[PDB]
Amino acid sequence: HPVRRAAVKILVHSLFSMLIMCTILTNCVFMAQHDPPPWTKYVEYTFTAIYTFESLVKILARGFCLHAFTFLRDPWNWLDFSVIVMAYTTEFVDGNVSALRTFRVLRALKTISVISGLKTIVGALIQSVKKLADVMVLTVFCLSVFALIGLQLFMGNLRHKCVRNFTELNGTNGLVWNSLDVYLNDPANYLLKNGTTDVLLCGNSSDAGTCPEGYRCLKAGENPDHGYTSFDSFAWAFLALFRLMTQDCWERLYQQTLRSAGKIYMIFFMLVIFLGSFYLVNLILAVVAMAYEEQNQATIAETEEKEECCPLWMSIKQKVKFVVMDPFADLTITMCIVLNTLFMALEHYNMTAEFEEMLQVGNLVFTGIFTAEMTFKIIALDPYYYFQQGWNIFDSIIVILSLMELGSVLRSFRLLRVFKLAKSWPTLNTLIKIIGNSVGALGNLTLVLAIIVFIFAVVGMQLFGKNYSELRHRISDSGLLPRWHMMDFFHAFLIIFRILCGEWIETMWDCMEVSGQSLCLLVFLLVMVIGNLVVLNLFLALLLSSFGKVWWRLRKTCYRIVEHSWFETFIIFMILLSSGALAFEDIYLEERKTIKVLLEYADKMFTYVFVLEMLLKWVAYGFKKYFTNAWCWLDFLIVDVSLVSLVANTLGFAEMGPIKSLRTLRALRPLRALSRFEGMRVVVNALVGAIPSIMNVLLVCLIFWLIFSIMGVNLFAGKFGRCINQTEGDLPLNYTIVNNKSECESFNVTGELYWTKVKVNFDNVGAGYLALLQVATFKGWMDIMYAAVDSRGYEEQPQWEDNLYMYIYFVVFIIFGSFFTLNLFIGVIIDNFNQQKKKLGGQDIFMTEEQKKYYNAMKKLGSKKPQKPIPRPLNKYQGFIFDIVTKQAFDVTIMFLICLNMVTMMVETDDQSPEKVNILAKINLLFVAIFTGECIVKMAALRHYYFTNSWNIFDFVVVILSIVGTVLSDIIQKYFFSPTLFRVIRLARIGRILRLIRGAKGIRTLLFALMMSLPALFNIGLLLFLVMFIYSIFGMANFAYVKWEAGIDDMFNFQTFANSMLCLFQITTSAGWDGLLSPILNTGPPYCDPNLPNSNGSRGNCGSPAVGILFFTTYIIISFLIVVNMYIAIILENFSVA
């Protein structure tokens, strides 16, 4: 038929796909708008018309009722049918809620149907979620187990607050309240943690927060920040542990818990962090990588299987070719490029006039140099080369661009010259290859990601815009717009970007406080899971596609005594005790007047014994076999430091600058441990066995962040210093009161006004590097961005959102500097570890010889063939019962009963009700009776069911311990009752839940992989604990007495050793390190008080910026590299065992 022919031709045409695509794109640009004019209503009709016309084309290109069913058969078409009927209904009939008008975002999905490769990527991205099923089950299982643990441990524990004393009068029941009635409604009376608008927590233990004089603490209170962080009511415990699993702002929950319960529970938090968070996240990584790998093999595999005048002009041309035949000056011009990078790099905030003049002079110099090079090389060999070769293309592009610029985004063009260093730099060539594959092979998947971000940004914006705009007061401190809202579309895209980066809870609290918990949790959890999944798939695709006789006498005695094991154990326990003596060096020495001199003599004895064994090594091994090992160098340097410190102590001239400014370097004393301990040694050989690759890629990222930092100097410089007034510690008042720095210096007639910059800012390339590290690591970036998207003038006060669209600077950076630079680091580092494994031919690293024995035996532990299957008991009743229990049904019955027990354990909260405690206790007795019955029958299977297999003895011991738990819990009243000793007997009930590992198979395999990785992780964490130790002692001697600011409260400090190890624990996960650097960087008043009384003679309460940045940046790099070791061990183990 004619109609059918026409329809088919249109359906197959290549032009109408472009039609559809442009219509969808314009629909998207019309959809991103909030409160559109009434004009757009007819454009909506136009869009519906085009959509229905295309649907008509498709159904008539099939051309019958059955054909319509065939059109419907393609699942992507269902989306189009739904959207046409939805547009038709929304025009036909609309009491009126009009909520359906956000369903038009489904049209944006049609892009993935029209593009040739988009649906391919989305279909290959669903299979990853289908492989991720076992890890999702294990993740929710661990989250549930840890949720029950934290629920019993911290039930309603976060509620604690610092309430002002209780005033009780005999009569009834400046006062005027009635106990519970006044207190819950009390809040203002509550004590507000200093420097923050949050309730302060407390604790009855002698480890939680000390409450000031006049403030006792009682569980009676509403909840923490907004009511969503509470640990009671297992639902919210599952929320808070999903938060500790994504590590989203987990330092806040960690600080709040340990402020409530007691600093001991950092054991719980580090158990969750180092086995729940890290291990589950890296298992997700591993399984996504494995699926992709299989697809690549198959995908790669499937592809593989296939069946002026003319004579003067010419003369001068030939002669100039003869003159400049050979430039061969790439070294000269590359040194010119390097000098130009260094010359632009010499920009800063307050540049002297002559300095800026010299900058411009060298500017013109280098521009002339580069034009000269281009002209000579274009009149040298051939202009068809500068026509063809893209290298010459962009060289000349930069030439013309610089000329146009000489003819503050202005200087963005000069910084293009930096890139051409890549032609001889294989590593920067690899980063260039990565950035190219981003928009090349993986361009379709980047498109999937962009479409997803768009869909969610427009969904959220017109789901919560009215709410964010009218309930704005319930979301911000003062009457103002929020810093993060969804009313516009730029801001909704920023919220979805933030959620992509990994920080969702802190804006979901707002979205729930304004909109409503159900759908807000729905959309944010959805964007979390989906967006992080596509980001993970993109990251992994890129990282994959990147590829006399007394002399003899004494010397023999010395050899025998040095190879004597008791001597080695002597020095081992010696260095242990010396590290301890270091650990006792906190601020409370002045109160410990005996341990002072005890450790004095101890230090003298340590340096004596160590120089003694040094001399023994000297006279025994000879100056060659000694100075050949590097650890001997390490011991020699350390004893050298201690000896010079000691001799300068005794022989006068000490206790002033250097020296005694070196005795803090004594905190390297633990470093002797790496030499002797067989695990730290192998892991360190694996780490410094990578400094080549690490330093290469760090130079690459230093050049790239140099580009970005120079851009940041030009855009922001001096544009950051607010001039905030003294009483409130915030931005001045408004732009009008104090607009300019030249105005606050006029209005400072009273000493109230200060014009002080933000701590981390862009004023050099140094602080530029620092602000980029903070931003690209995601911790501490809130301050940089707020100050930058407030930057109005050059020294003018910042209005609240002027220069708004800068946010795009941090967006483009964060992408190109964290999803790409950290992709380079990770990819190269992982490749390096793989190469090391291949070279060792052993293929195993981080494990010593005995650890290899453990590993092989544990691998053998997975023996598949059982013993004699089962003996029939030869007895009548034993036979009947053995038949009724050996059936595979019996296991499923017990499994459902124990999942019902789990659900019984999920439903307790704090202060539930007495009758509820009774019902739950009776149900506990009932389940322990059922399990005792299962136990006795199993033991009566024949004779040995409770000894044949490890799972059975686990069942047996948990049954016994549950019986004991009941028989002790009912007799609490007779002998003695305790508040906390009951919780431990209550918590061993979690043992029953762990039965579920048996019937489950995926959970068993993944947990077994973790078990096989436990020794490697042990050695790695041993090195990490040693590093926490070194750094904690260094900070204890260094970072003590610093002012109490954002990340350093009374409980989390560097004063004692407990506090330092805690702060360093949270900084191990890169968390909160902005908060701990913030009080070190400040030098000088207003905030600090240089020269202040201290317990120790040393004066001042302000940290050293120079040493603080070194400390924190180096610790982040080291810890990041060691948790890359963790990621690597985990991935190897997973693949190896599954």
Ligand X SMILES: CCCCCCCC/C=C\CCCCCCCC(=O)O[C@H](COC(=O)CCCCCCCCCCCCCCC)COP(=O)(O)OCCN
Ligand Y SMILES: *[C@@H]1O[C@H](CO)[C@@H](O[C@@H]2O[C@H](CO)[C@@H](O)[C@H](O)[C@H]2NC(C)=O)[C@H](O)[C@H]1NC(C)=O
Ligand Z SMILES: O=C(NC[C@H]1CCCCN1)c1cc(OCC(F)(F)F)ccc1OCC(F)(F)F
Ligand U SMILES: COCC(CCO[C@H]1CC[C@@]2(C)C(=CC[C@H]3[C@@H]4C[C@@H]5O[C@]6(CC[C@@H](C)CO6)[C@@H](C)[C@@H]5[C@@]4(C)CC[C@@H]32)C1)COC
Ligand V SMILES: *[C@@H]1O[C@H](CO)[C@@H](O[C@@H]2O[C@H](CO)[C@@H](O[C@H]3O[C@H](CO)[C@@H](O)[C@H](O)[C@@H]3O)[C@H](O)[C@H]2NC(C)=O)[C@H](O)[C@H]1NC(C)=O
Q: Which chain residues interact with ligand Z by CB under 6 A? A: 500-501, 535-536, 539, 777-778, 814-815, 818-819, 822, 1070, 1120
Pick from 119, 164, 219, 348 the residue near ligand V by CB under 6 A.
219
As a whole number of angstroms, the distance between CA 889 and CA 947 comes to: 21
CB of 219 to ligand V, least distance (A): 5
Using rule CB under 6 A, residue 220 touches ligand V: no
Alpha helices in 200-248 (DSSP H): 234-246
Asked if 323 interacts with ligand X (CB under 6 A), we say: no
Q: To 10 degrees, the CA torsion angle through 122, 128, 134, 139?
A: -80
Cα–Cα dist 376/335, whole Å: 18
Amino acid identity, residue 335?
M
Minimum CB distance to ligand Y smaller for 1011 or for 1092: 1092
- Which residues, 658 to 697, sit near ligand U by CB under 6 A? none
> Applying CB under 6 A, does 267 fall inside the site for ligand U?
yes
CA 1039 – CA 1053 distance, rounded (Å): 9
* Of 8, 115, 137, 346, the one binding ligand U by CB under 6 A: 346
Subset of 965-994 contacting ligand Y (CB under 6 A): none
Q: Judge whether 579 and 669 are in contact, CB under 8 Å.
A: yes
Which secondary-structure segment (H or E) carries 216? strand 215-218
Element (H, E) at 161: strand 161-164
CA distance 1058 to 1047: 16
Q: Which of 251, 488, 795, 796 binds ligand X (CB under 6 A)?
A: 488
Q: Is 664 in the site for ligand X (CB under 6 A)?
A: yes
Whether 377 contacts 327, CB under 8 Å: yes
Distance, in Å, from the CA atom of 321 to the CA atom of 323, rounded to the nearest integer, reads 5
To which H or E segment does residue 30 belong?
helix 14-31
Residues 6+ apart with CB under 8 A from 1087: 1043, 1045, 1102
Least distance (Å) between residue 1093 CB and ligand Y = 17
| Omega before 1086 within 30 of 0, i.e. cis | yes
Tell whether residue 30 is a contact of ligand X (CB under 6 A): no
* Residue 1049 touching ligand NAG (CB under 6 A): yes
Sort 165 into a burial class: Cβ within 10 Å, 0-12 / 13-18 / 19+.
Answer: exposed
**CB closer to ligand X, 362 vs 502:** 502
By CB under 6 A, is residue 54 in contact with ligand X?
A: no
Cα 878 to its chain centre, rounded Å, is 58
Contacts of 494 (CB under 8 A, 6+ apart): 484, 807, 811
Of 533 and 961, nearer to ligand X (C-beta) is 533
Binding piece for ligand NAG, criterion CB under 6 A, among 17-25, 522-530, 957-965, 1042-1050: 1042-1050
Binding test (CB under 6 A) with ligand NAG, winner from 5, 216, 560, 1001: 216
Contact 503, 785 (CB under 8 A): no
Give the pair of three-digit tokens for residue 1109: 């940045």
Number of residues that bind ligand X (CB under 6 A): 60
**Burial annotation 1059-1084 (CB, 10 A radius, 16+ → b, else e):** bbbbbbbbbbbbbbbbbbbbbbbbee
Q: Taking CB within 5 to 8 Å according to partner kind, which of ligand V, ligand NAG, ligand U, none is near residue 204?
A: ligand V
1038 near ligand X, judged by CB under 6 A: yes
Candidate residues 89, 194, 389, 557; the one interacting with ligand NAG per rule CB under 6 A: 194
In angstroms, the CA 1025 to CA 155 distance is 30
Binding flag, residue 744, ligand Y (CB under 6 A): yes
What mask of x and - would describe binding to ligand U in positions 757 to 776, judged by CB under 6 A? -------xxx----------
Residue of the chain from 141, 370, 468, 755 that contacts ligand Y (CB under 6 A): 755
Backbone angles phi, psi at 402, to 5 degrees: -65, -40
Which one of 48-56, 738-746, 760-768, 913-921 is the stretch in contact with ligand Y (CB under 6 A)?
738-746
The DSSP string of 735-755 is TTTS-BHHHHHHHTTSTTB--
Site for ligand Y in 65-104 (CB under 6 A): none
Token pair of 260 as six digits: 């409530």
Among 711, 770, 1012, 1042, binds ligand U (CB under 6 A): 711
Min dist CB 852 to ligand Z, Å, is 30
- Choosing among ligand Z, ligand V, ligand NAG, none, which partner's interface includes residue 1049 (Cβ < 5 to 8 Å by kind)? ligand NAG
Do the Cβ atoms of 1077 and 1109 come closer than 8 Å? yes
Single out the segment in contact with ligand Y by CB under 6 A; choices: 9-17, 164-172, 386-394, 735-743.
735-743
Q: How far apart are CA 1031 and CA 41, in angstroms?
A: 64
Asked if 1058 interacts with ligand U (CB under 6 A), we say: yes
Pick from 2, 75, 95, 214 the residue near ligand NAG by CB under 6 A: 214
Asked if 834 is part of the footprint of ligand V (rule: CB under 6 A), the reply reads no
The residues that touch ligand U, with contacts defined as CB under 6 A, are 207, 263-264, 266-267, 342, 345-346, 348, 409, 412, 702, 706, 711, 715, 764-766, 803, 805-806, 808-809, 812, 1025, 1058, 1061-1062
Binding site for ligand V (CB under 6 A): 160, 204, 218-219
Provide the binding-site residues for ligand Y, judged by CB under 6 A: 739-740, 742-745, 748, 751, 753-755, 796, 1085
Give the footprint of ligand X on this chain (CB under 6 A).
28-29, 32, 99, 227, 233-236, 239, 459, 488-490, 516-519, 521-522, 525-526, 529, 576, 579-580, 583-584, 661, 664-665, 671, 677, 698, 701, 764, 766-767, 769-770, 773, 808, 811-812, 903, 906-907, 909, 1037-1038, 1057-1058, 1105-1107, 1109-1110, 1113-1114, 1117
